[PDB]
Every structure is written in C-alpha cells, then in structure tokens.
A and B are shown apart, each in its own frame.
Chain A
Amino acid sequence: VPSLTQKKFLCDRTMWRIPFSSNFMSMGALTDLGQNMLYANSAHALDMT
C-alpha cells in the first residue's frame, strides 16, 4: 500500500538544558555572559514563551 512516513523521537529520564554561555559550551561554573559587566550591574526581565 502507498504510505507516508511519520517519525518522532523519544527521550526520558533527563531534561533539556540551555546554558547561558555564548557558544552554549560549559567552560566553568560561571559562564561567559554571566560574569559580563552587563547582567551583573543591570536588571533584565524576560518574557519567554
């Protein structure tokens, strides 16, 4: 019979994570954009979706 594909994935036991560093690479406890002069003197609300 003719047929169309349908692919998903499956992940369990763990959760996604998005690191705050610039290249999204974990190079320490603090991050690159973390110890910036920005975000450590100023405040920033965020408006996720």
Chain B
Amino acid sequence: QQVDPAMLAALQSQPSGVTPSDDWAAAMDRILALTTRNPEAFRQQPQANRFSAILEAVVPSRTNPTHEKVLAIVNALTESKAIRKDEAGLIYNALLERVARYNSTNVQANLDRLTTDVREAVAQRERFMHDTNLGSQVALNAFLSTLPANVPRGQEDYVSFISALRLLVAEVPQSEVYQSGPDYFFQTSRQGLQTVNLTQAFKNLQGMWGVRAPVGDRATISSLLTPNTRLLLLLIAPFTNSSTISRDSYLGHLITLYREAIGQTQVDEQTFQEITSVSRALGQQDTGSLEATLNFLL
C-alpha cells in the first residue's frame, strides 16, 4: 500500500512523541512558545517534563542510527519479495550483527548510500510495472526472434499482426508471456484464464495468411483452425483497427467479425444491467429473472 520502505523504517523506529534527540527543530519549536496550534503549552508542564526536555534540546544527545538504517534495507528487500516475510526477524538479527562486526566510518556511510537508491533508484520497479517488460516485452522479443519472417502468401499482414500483438502485451500491465517447456504461452491476466498456446497458434496460422475466402463458408475450420487460435484472435480483436487486415482475407472474416461479437456484448451488458434492476422495481421472481433474460441475449 505504501510507496517507500524507509518511511516504514521511520515509522517502526522513531518516537511518535516529539523528542529533541532526533527532531530538534520541532522540540525547540514548542519550548520557546512559538506554535500556531496550542502555543501556551510548555510553561504549564511542571519541573518533571520541562528539564527532561529543555536540557536535552539546547544540547542534543548523540544516538546511533545503526539499528534504524538497516530497517530501511531489510524492509526494502522484503517489499520486493527477496526474503520471505517469515524470515526478516532473522536477517535483521544477522545484518545488525554484520554491520557491528565490521563497522567503520565507511560502512555507516555505505548503508546510507544504499538507503537512497532503494528510494529514488527503485523507480525502475515503478517503471516496469507500467512498461511490463518483466515478462511481456523482452520475453516476447525472443518469440519474434523465433518465428520465420518468410511467409509465402501475405507477406505484409504477417508483420502487422505481430505489430499489433506487441502492442497487446504493452498496453496491458497484467498480461505476460513466458518460457515453460519447449513452447511459449500468453495469459491475459495473472490469476487468469485464457492461456493461449502461442507456439501452436502461429504454427496453425502459418500457411494461412493468404486465402481470399468467400463469405459462404463457416463450418470448415474445425479441421483448419484450432479454438485457441480462435481465442488468440479474440484477444487481438480490441487492439486491431480496420486497417490491419483490410476486408477480404479469411482473417477479415474472423478478426472483423470477432470485434462485432465483442461489439454485441459491450452494449448488451448495459441492457443486462437494466433487466436485472427492474425485476426488483416491479416485483419479479429472482429465479425466473435470469432464465428468460439470457435467452433473449444469446
């Protein structure tokens, strides 16, 4: 939920009340009675909690940030799942033994360099959540360095389909591709369904890019296509404008018609939101509020 780990290190090892040992500029801010909200609040403390603050502010203490700088590292390693969460009580029990064994002027200044690049040079972790080359760009640029670029029929639409497929894994942060076994896959979401067999799809689409099929043929592709190729073309449909594969290829009978099939449900869901909200507006059997509703929409 947080952005930075060192703020949680500054939340688990700093005093919540204002002390002059660490925040002098706020502890002296209220001794001299110069504060906007509640100014006159330090005279009326007795000699117990005046001298226990007014001595320690005009000459500060000299504490040791060794126990605090390591929590800005041990947290920064468990935020990125390098360590198990069940385990950080051991490594801080081992790093604090480490940097007190080999302590110097250098290591106290070398940890302090390392609690800055886990703050402002950990912006790469903010970066490839957006560009998602975790598993979407550099894991697919091996796939595009695997397919043959010499297709006999349809030389131009072959390199515009994968030009529209690299855009698919780029405009979606959740989708990713990977190497499992001798073939590459592609899931549209983490914790997600609809895994396409990406090797067994472009091998099915090879020798298929030029057909120029007529518009009176529907039930032939049970022995020609494969339903995951029929689902990969479903996942390429919203990111494919009308200028990719124009009109008369058999993919124009597929990719354009898949956008119309998505174009049905992206307005009939708004119809389905109306019907399920008027069954309780007039009084309708909720068991029979979905049987006849779906049959009108399928």
Contacts and interface: CB of A to CB of B under 8 A. Distances in A.
A36 interface: yes
B293 to A, nearest CB: 10
Interface in B241-298: 287, 290-291, 294
A37 interface: yes
Contacts of A36: 287, 291
Counting chain A CB atoms within 10 Å of each CB, the highest count among B287, B290, B291 belongs to B287
Contacts of B287: 36, 38
A9 B287 CA distance: 39
B193 to A, nearest CB: 16
Q: How many A residues touch the partner, as a band?
A: under 10
A37 B290 CA distance: 8
Contacts of A37: 290-291, 294
Interface in A29-49: 36-38
Interface in A1-49: 36-38
- Determine the main DSSP class of A at the interface with B: loop
Contacts of B290: 37
B197 to A, nearest CB: 26
Contacts of B294: 37
A22 to B, nearest CB: 9
A20 to B, nearest CB: 14
Interface in B107-138: none
Contacts of B291: 36-37
A37 B292 CA distance: 11
A36 B287 CA distance: 8
A23 B43 CA distance: 82
Nearest to A22: B287
A38 B291 CA distance: 10
Contacts of A38: 287
Nearest to B291: A37
A30 B265 CA distance: 30
Interface in B39-59: none
A11 to B, nearest CB: 34
Nearest to A37: B290
Nearest to B290: A37
A37 B288 CA distance: 9
Nearest to B293: A37
A16 to B, nearest CB: 27
Nearest to A32: B287
A38 B290 CA distance: 10
Nearest to B294: A37
Interface in B187-202: none
B216 to A, nearest CB: 36
B290 to A, nearest CB: 5
B294 to A, nearest CB: 8
A30 to B, nearest CB: 13
6 contacts: A36-B287, A36-B291, A37-B290, A37-B291, A37-B294, A38-B287
Q: Top 4 closest A-B pairs, CB basis?
A: A37-B290, A37-B291, A36-B287, A36-B291
